[PDB]
């Protein structure tokens, strides 16, 4: 239902969009959000859904907002407000200048140098998974590849038992697309309860895994506390278990429905990296936000202290004012404009690991299973939230057309 419209919010700016169940979801999640960019929708609207909040609908405002951390603080980054207030992950819940000392350490565990160190293993897993699937001539992509491929890689980096994935993934999903069985606060606490004993164990017997590095690391010269390590490790876990998983599904669904695009990569493998970026734009999937630190007039709209504003990273690249024919996938698009990995001081620290996982996937899959389609009659269903995803993606193919490496 709709929260009563606050006195300061203009009546004509109301557009009741529900980020957890957009009305046009059946056409595809990106399409559902794109309705916010239809001809008569303002640059900044107010939805009375989920407690009521602002929504920047165009890249120009989304980028500005993300750059102005003074006015748009990440202290309360999630909608609804309850989730946003319980949200205390490091470094994501902090703004510069305090954010930096913590972001630096986090960059040390998932940055480019670590990704290069994971190249071999990422490659090996990708190939083992696809080869095992190749002869079967079918698969449930979300559970057969999208989830295990990137999640196992992350669990390897964090030195955590794979058998722990079911629980952690369940908790992460409740924070991004809650089924209603758990509030953000409850899911966060379970995530923290899980980490506490591990963090203590690794601060005693330091390992080389991401968790040991964080728990035994320093923050601009001084030792990090147990609580800080917990708040950071929990964030790393959430970031490594949802985004790449669902992005791969969006990309492969598209590829399964587009033979011509598959051929382009088949005949022109050098384009895979470029295709990666275009897909990252077209199937952008996250949308979190900021909270107003003080009353502030933004693009002619009076925003009040405390007001929450959703700044959909997903919307920038879909904005027709940033890319012509935005909904069209063009692997040759001259200037791929987007904010898929965020924008500002919080730019995705795992974007390098993500790009690597995406390119290796496209490369290794197309090489062994160049021809595949979506299971006949299958009605693909998307789900919306802080991170949007694909519920299921049944693929099929003729093993005869496949190739073993
Ligand atoms: C396609 C995949 C990915 C997408 C689209 C994505 C997107 C995002 C976005 C939009 C933000 C910033 C949100 C904000 O400003 O509040 C972000 C931050 C972050 N991401 Fe990702 N991400 C991806 C993969 C990864 C991976 C693999 C990791 C690894 C753990 C990761 C780690 C992080 C971290 C640590 C931050 C917080 C940075 C900070 O707060 O300064 N991300 N990501
Ligand atoms: C918006 C995000 C993708 C980013 C990493 C996990 C996530 C859900 C956060 O809370 C910060
Ligand atoms: K009003
Ligand atoms: K908070």
**Block residue for tokens 């299971």:** 375
User: Which value in Å is the resolution of this experimental model?
Assistant: 2.1
Tokens 């093993």 sit on residue: 399
| 348 noted as active-site residue | yes
Q: Which two tokens stand for residue 10?
A: 């203009």
Beta-carbon contacts of residue 255 (< 8 Å; ≥ 6 apart)? 261, 262, 372
Alpha-carbon span 262 to 307, nearest angstrom: 45
3-state helix, strand, coil in the chain (%, to 5): 50, 10, 35
Per CATH, domain 1-405 is 1.10.630.10:
yes
Active site residue 242: yes
Q: What sign for the dihedral angle of Cα 376, 378, 379, 382? A: negative
Buried b (16+ CB within 10 A) or exposed e, 327-356: eebbbebeebebbbbbbbbbebbbbbbbbb
C-alpha distance from residue 391 to each of 164, 241, 276, 283, 381 (Å): 21, 15, 22, 15, 6
Taking the C-alpha atoms of residue 213 and residue 50, their distance in angstroms, rounded to an integer, is 38
Domain ranges within the chain, ordered by starting residue: 1-405
Q: How far is CA 121 from CA 57, 114, 240, in A?
A: 40, 12, 16
Q: Best mutation site among 88, 312, 348, 361 for ligand 1, i.e. most ligand atoms within 8 A of its Cβ?
A: 348
Experimental approach taken: X-ray
Q: Which ligand is nearest to the CA of 151?
A: 1
The pair of three-digit structure tokens given for residue 165, joined into one six-digit string: 């994935």
What's the CA-to-centroid distance between 76 and ligand 4, angstroms?
A: 5
Cβ neighbours of residue 281 under 8 Å, at least 6 residues apart? 317, 318, 323, 333, 336, 337, 338, 340
CB 224 within 8 A of CB 211: no
Give the separation between CA 75 and CA 93, rounded to whole angstroms: 5
Any catalytic annotation for residue 134? no
CA distance 216 to 208: 10
Is there a cis peptide before residue 195, judged by omega within 30 degrees of 0?
no
In 3D, which of 201, 173, 198, 203 has the Cα closest to residue 188?
173
């Amino acid at each position: 239902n709709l929260a009563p419209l606050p006195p300061h919010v203009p009546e004509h700016l109301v557009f009741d969009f529900d980020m957890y169940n957009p009305s046009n979801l059946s056409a595809g999640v990106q399409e559902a959000w794109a309705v916010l960019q239809e001809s008569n929708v303002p640059d900044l609207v107010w939805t009375r859904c989920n407690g009521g909040h602002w929504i920047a609908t165009r890249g120009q405002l989304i980028r500005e907002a993300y750059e102005d951390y003074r006015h748009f603080s990440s202290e309360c980054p999630f909608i609804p407000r309850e989730a946003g207030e319980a949200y205390d992950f490091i470094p994501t819940s902090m703004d510069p200048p305090e954010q930096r000392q913590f972001r630096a350490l986090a960059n040390q565990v998932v940055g480019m140098p670590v990704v290069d160190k994971l190249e071999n293993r990422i490659q090996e897993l990708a190939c083992s998974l696809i080869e095992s699937l190749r002869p079967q001539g079918q698969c449930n992509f979300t559970e057969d590849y999208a989830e295990p491929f990137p999640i196992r890689i992350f669990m390897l980096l964090a030195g955590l038992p794979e058998e722990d994935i079911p629980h952690l993934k369940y908790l992460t999903d409740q924070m991004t697309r809650p089924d209603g069985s758990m509030t953000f606060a409850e899911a966060k606490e379970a995530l923290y309860d899980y980490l506490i004993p591990i963090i203590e164990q690794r601060r005693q017997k330091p390992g080389t895994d991401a968790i040991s590095i964080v728990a035994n690391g320093q923050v601009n010269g001084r030792p990090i506390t147990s609580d800080e390590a917990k708040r950071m490790c929990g964030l790393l876990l959430v970031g490594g278990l949802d985004t790449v998983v669902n992005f791969l599904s969006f990309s492969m669904e598209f590829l399964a429905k587009s033979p011509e695009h598959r051929q382009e990569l088949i005949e022109r493998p050098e384009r895979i990296p470029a295709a990666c970026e275009e897909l990252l734009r077209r199937f952008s999937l996250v949308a979190d936000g900021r909270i107003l630190t003080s009353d502030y007039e933004f693009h002619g709209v009076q925003l009040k202290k405390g007001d929450q504003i959703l700044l959909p990273q997903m919307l920038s690249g879909l904005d027709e004012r940033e890319n012509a024919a935005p909904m069209h996938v063009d692997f040759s698009r001259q200037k791929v404009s987007h904010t898929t990995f965020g924008h500002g001081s919080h730019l995705c620290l795992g974007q390098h690991l993500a790009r690597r996982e995406i390119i290796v996937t496209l490369k290794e899959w197309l090489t062994r299973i160049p021809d595949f389609s979506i299971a006949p009659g299958a009605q693909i269903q998307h789900k919306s939230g802080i991170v949007s995803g694909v519920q299921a993606l049944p693929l099929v193919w003729d093993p005869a057309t496949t190739k073993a490496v």
